[PDB]
Scaffold this active site. Structure first.
Site, short mmCIF file in Angstrom:
data_model
loop_
_atom_site.label_atom_id
_atom_site.label_comp_id
_atom_site.label_asym_id
_atom_site.label_seq_id
_atom_site.Cartn_x
_atom_site.Cartn_y
_atom_site.Cartn_z
N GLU A 96 3.45 -4.95 12.25
CA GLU A 96 2.35 -4.13 12.65
C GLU A 96 2.17 -4.21 14.15
O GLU A 96 1.79 -3.19 14.73
CB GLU A 96 1.16 -4.61 11.90
N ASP A 136 5.42 -9.88 7.58
CA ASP A 136 4.00 -9.62 7.22
C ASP A 136 3.30 -10.97 7.23
O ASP A 136 3.55 -11.81 6.34
CB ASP A 136 3.86 -9.02 5.81
N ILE A 150 0.16 -12.31 6.90
CA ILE A 150 -0.72 -12.59 5.77
C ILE A 150 -0.74 -11.32 4.92
O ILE A 150 -1.23 -10.29 5.37
CB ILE A 150 -2.14 -12.87 6.25
N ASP A 151 -0.16 -11.32 3.74
CA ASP A 151 -0.33 -10.20 2.84
C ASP A 151 -1.46 -10.57 1.87
O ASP A 151 -1.33 -11.55 1.12
CB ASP A 151 0.98 -9.96 2.10
N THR A 168 -5.24 -9.87 2.73
CA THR A 168 -6.39 -10.10 3.61
C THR A 168 -7.75 -10.27 2.95
O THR A 168 -8.40 -11.31 3.17
CB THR A 168 -6.25 -8.93 4.58
#
Lengths: 262, 262
Positions: free
Chosen positions: B56, B76, B78-79, B81
């Site tokens: 991101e 990724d 922290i998948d 949140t």
């Protein structure tokens, strides 16, 4: 009653093990369900022949779920059947015990996770010896809810189950989860992991054990109307607090259902 | 590439730990997210300065997610949140690695559970050293599906997300679960715990790691149309097999979405 409780915890573990052993490997879920309630019922009759018991066996043998003053065990041998079958990881053994028509303790064991949740009226809630405390969220827009979609494929019903989920999703709330068992969903609210659980269509044996664990962790149970929780009404809102509970209450719509009573 | 992979597993564990430590205790989820991708990105740049990375950060800094032939890490941090914030127990760290535009390995770590899922093209899928094999269910009426409700409260969108859930619920299927993370949901299909996962609105970094674990466990990924899976299309059906995958495909309806590409 502590001996009764401490007995019930050993009986929940053992039952837990038969469920787990059978999850490694008339269908398997039925074979294991019949074995565990035989295990659970004649073990309570031998040690406590005085005590009554409500469960699905007693209801199916024509007796009415009507709670009297005498020690009643409200047993759920395997909560999370569809889960059992898929190895979806959450099945619970549930045991709730009532005297003078009020639940005195509840013991819920999540097999596949190895977690043993217990609570006793007045002495608090614990997951595996650690004390549970519900959350502090009073803002509905930051709350996370758990619920289930039902076991009914009747489209008038399915459309209302989804209709109520929509209204709450659009409030907005933070999100909604479904783990597949009512007993485990209520334990998630007891830990603080979720802020509220509602469901219409459960049975008293599904919630009698975990209801006391929500309240000794500091939460509230109440009816889908705003009124007092009613164990035999087929409907529950287990929340972290009244604010949230009432919120959920004012927005959903009832699904007519036949009380466990009638 | 095995050193890269074996490196990535240590980097997933360490990141896992920062997420877990912070779950015991600019908001906390943002503070922890910024720390873990800094941890993750400069650790891959120091050891592998040749390699590209999509995530991101790179997209938000204006670069386009377009995959080239060079070793790319699709990260990724922290998948899960909303889960993180509620302590709802499923957050994953995800790392997928591609050469010549095909994913070579994926590593997904479910913090709070302590589970480390890995897979490498050709050498199979494992949860914590034990090999994973998807289910054999080819009958849709006995299949259990996992999906999520979306992060969008746009009512045209919410009504379609619920519309598609309704059609599948009424097929009927055995049930639907939502655990709150796309990476963990795909690992549940890899173990055999669920039979299929679909979602429209995810991002390539959410699924690049677990996609290879579904396939090395013996399943299929494909597009919501029936066509080939497309990592940059914002949509996925991760199933145990084509039969089921196509079934889901023929019944749902697309939610227009802007490719990660454009």
């Amino acid at each position: 009653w502590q001996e009764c409780m401490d007995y019930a915890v050993t009986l929940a573990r053992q039952a837990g093990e038969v469920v787990c052993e059978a999850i490694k490997n008339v269908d398997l879920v039925t074979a294991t369900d019949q074995k565990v309630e035989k295990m659970l019922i004649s073990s309570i009759k031998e040690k406590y022949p005085s005590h009554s018991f409500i469960g699905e066996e007693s209801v199916a043998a024509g007796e009415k779920s009507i709670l009297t003053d005498n020690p009643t065990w409200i047993i759920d041998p395997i909560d999370g059947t569809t889960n059992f079958v898929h190895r979806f990881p959450f099945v619970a053994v549930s045991i709730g015990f009532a005297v003078n028509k009020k639940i005195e303790f509840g013991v819920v064991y999540s097999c596949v996770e190895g977690k043993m949740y217990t609570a006793r009226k007045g002495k608090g809630a614990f997951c595996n010896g650690q004390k549970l405390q519900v959350s502090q969220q009073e803002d509905i827009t930051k709350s996370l809810l758990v619920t289930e979609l039902g076991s009914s494929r009747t489209p008038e019903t399915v459309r209302m189950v989804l209709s109520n989920m929509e209204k709450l999703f659009c409030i907005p709330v933070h999100g909604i989860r479904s783990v597949g068992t009512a007993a485990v969903n209520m334990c998630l609210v007891a830990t603080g992991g979720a802020d509220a659980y509602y469901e219409m269509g459960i049975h008293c044996w599904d919630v009698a054990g975990a209801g006391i664990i929500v309240t000794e962790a500091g939460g509230v149970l109440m009816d889908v109307t705003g009124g007092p929780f009613d164990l035999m009404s087929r409907r529950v809102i287990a929340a972290n607090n009244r604010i949230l509970a009432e919120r959920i209450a004012k927005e959903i719509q009832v699904i007519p259902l036949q009380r466990d009573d009638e």
